[PDB]
Amino acid sequence: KSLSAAAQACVKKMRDAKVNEACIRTFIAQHVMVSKGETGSIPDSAIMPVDSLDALDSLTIECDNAVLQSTVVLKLNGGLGTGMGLCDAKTLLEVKDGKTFLDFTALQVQYLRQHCSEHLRFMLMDSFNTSASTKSFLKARYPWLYQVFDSEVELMQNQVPKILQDTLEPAAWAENPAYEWAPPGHGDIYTALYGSGKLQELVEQGYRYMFVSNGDNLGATIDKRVLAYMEKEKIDFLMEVCRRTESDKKGGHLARQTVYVKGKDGQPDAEKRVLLLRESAQCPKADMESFQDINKYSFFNTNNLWIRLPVLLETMQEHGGTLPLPVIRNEKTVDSSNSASPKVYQLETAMGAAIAMFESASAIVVPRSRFAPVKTCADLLALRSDAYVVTDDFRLVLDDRCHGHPPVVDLDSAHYKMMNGFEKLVQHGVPSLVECKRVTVKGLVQFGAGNVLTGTVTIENTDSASAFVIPDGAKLNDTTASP
Numbered sequence: 001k002s003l004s005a006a007a008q009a010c011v012k013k014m015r016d017a018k019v020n021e022a023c024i025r026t027f028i029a030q031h032v033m034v035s036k037g038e039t040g041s042i043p044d045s046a047i048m049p050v051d052s053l054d055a056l057d058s059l060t061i062e063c064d065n066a067v068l069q070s071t072v073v074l075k076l077n078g079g080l081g082t083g084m085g086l087c088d089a090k091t092l093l094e095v096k097d098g099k100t101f102l103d104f105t106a107l108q109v110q111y112l113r114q115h116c117s118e119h120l121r122f123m124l125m126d127s128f129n130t131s132a133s134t135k136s137f138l139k140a141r142y143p144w145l146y147q148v149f150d151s152e153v154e155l156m157q158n159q160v161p162k163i164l165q166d167t168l169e170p171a172a173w174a175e176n177p178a179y180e181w182a183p184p185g186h187g188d189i190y191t192a193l194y195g196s197g198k199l200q201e202l203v204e205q206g207y208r209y210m211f212v213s214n215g216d217n218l219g220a221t222i223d224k225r226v227l228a229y230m231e232k233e234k235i236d237f238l239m240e241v242c243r244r245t246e247s248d249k250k251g252g253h254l255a256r257q258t259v260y261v262k263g264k265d266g267q268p269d270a271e272k273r274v275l276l277l278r279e280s281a282q283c284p285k286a287d288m289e290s291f292q293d294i295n296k297y298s299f300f301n302t303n304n305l306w307i308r309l310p311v312l313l314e315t316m317q318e319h320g321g322t323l324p325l326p327v328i329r330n331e332k333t334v335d336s337s338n339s340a341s342p343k344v345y346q347l348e349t350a351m352g353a354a355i356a357m358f359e360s361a362s363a364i365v366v367p368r369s370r371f372a373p374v375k376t377c378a379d380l381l382a383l384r385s386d387a388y389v390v391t392d393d394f395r396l397v398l399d400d401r402c403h404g405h406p407p408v409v410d411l412d413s414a415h416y417k418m419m420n421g422f423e424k425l426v427q428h429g430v431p432s433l434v435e436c437k438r439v440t441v442k443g444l445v446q447f448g449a450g451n452v453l454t455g456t457v458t459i460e461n462t463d464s465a466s467a468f469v470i471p472d473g474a475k476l477n478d479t480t481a482s483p
């Protein structure tokens with residue numbers, strides 16, 4: 001085999017568990033990379049700034065409906081709402097008027113199928129954690145999607161073995177064998193699409209474009225101009241990027257680099273520029289100052305991706321049925337809450353890293369409205385308020401009175417990092433935030449019905465530990481509210 005004993009044990013374990021071969025193939029290639037001693041470092045000297053890109057705001061031409069007839073909308077749906085105190089699927093959290101993330105996506109897909117392209121496809125990448133809840137949700141609200149859920153809609157995310165840090169064997173945890181497996185990140189989309197045969201099914205059915213995005217990003221909506229841009233400029237992989245702010249300096253950034261490819265078979269050697277991403281775990285320690293210079297590297301990946309499916313098929317077929325992405329070596333314990341459990345590596349890939357694998361690749365600067373994830377209960381509060389309205393095509397946008405700027409919400413760790421605390425805060429009503437520039441809430445607070453906030457409002461409770469309610473109908477303007 002030339003595989004090490006550790007790699008063979010991984011193969012044996014995944015074989016025994018009926019893991020599909022395209023996943024084993026890809027994972028073993030990553031295992032070899034790790035076992036070779038791959039650092040995965042990306043210094044500033046191997047990379048260069050992007051400098052200039054096109055802008056969605058500057059585009060005007062829309063594609064005709066025939067392109068949408070050959071387009072697949074795929075939403076990443078494997079993540080839980082753990083970061084907000086939610087042990088179930090993130091996309092099933094209510095956002096507006098009883099509608100979840102999944103509602104708006106399905107209603108947007110429904111609007112397009114009714115008014116533009118009946119053959120537009122909708123897919124969901126689920127994990128074992130989110131599958132049953134999603135299927136049950138669609139069965140009640142969108143039967144047409146439920147009828148074809150198993151056959152057409154759902155894409156299952158793989159699970160790969162966690163491996164020990166010292167010997168790289170498949171880790172063992174008798175207390176909970178499920179903790180031996182872990183998802184390989186959203187870069188697994190390419191492996192799942194190929195290995196499940198769905199990528200080949202989509203291409204042979206005539207589908208040409210796939211728009212991938214995070215399920216919990218309410219701004220990632222179909223924009224016909226992006227499809228026209230790719231048809232005109234002959235793009236196989238387009239990444240939507242936004243400009244990095246000071247709060248984004250810890251996140252990844254787009255970059256350029258130049259590669260010399262030794263010619264395989266009889267064809268000549270090739271030199272070319274490619275796009276790529278660099279996150280902090282890849283950046284050398286000494287280059288971290290440059291990593292955070294938002295004026296040098298000014299763009300970050302939104303995970304809004306547009307891919308040519310026939311080109312992706314050819315590329316993965318050229319690499320033995322895989323897509324070789326840079327591996328992230330996540331160091332945890334096999335039970336991350338048990339500090340004495342065996343230390344392990346969790347091998348992961350990012351789906352935005354595939355931009356370096358396509359010859360006709362490009363990035364486009366989009367407004368930050370297209371990158372609007374709900375990562376805090378503060379974000380959720382603004383969205384549920386009247387500061388946001390629903391369009392006739394089921395998009396969520398600001399009301400005009402906000403004049404393009406959303407109300408800032410800062411909420412206290414105490415009480416509100418989790419949904420359980422936030423749910424009592426809006427027990428009898430959600431306050432109007434359409435006119436509020438900024439609301440900070442310190443300590444425990446509850447809202448009454450019909451409340452309105454305007455200007456910059458602060459509400460502090462100095463460790464009272466008692467109730468601290470706010471009456472029904474009150475309106476706070478440019479003030480601070482204390483007991």
Ligand SMILES: Oc1ccc(/C=C/c2cc(O)cc(O)c2)cc1
Pocket residue numbers: 241242243244245365366367368369370
């Ligand atoms: O509808 C719109 C919503 C938001 C915006 C502002 C966008 C913006 C875009 C960037 O690349 C960086 C940034 O800090 C902000 C523009 C239009």
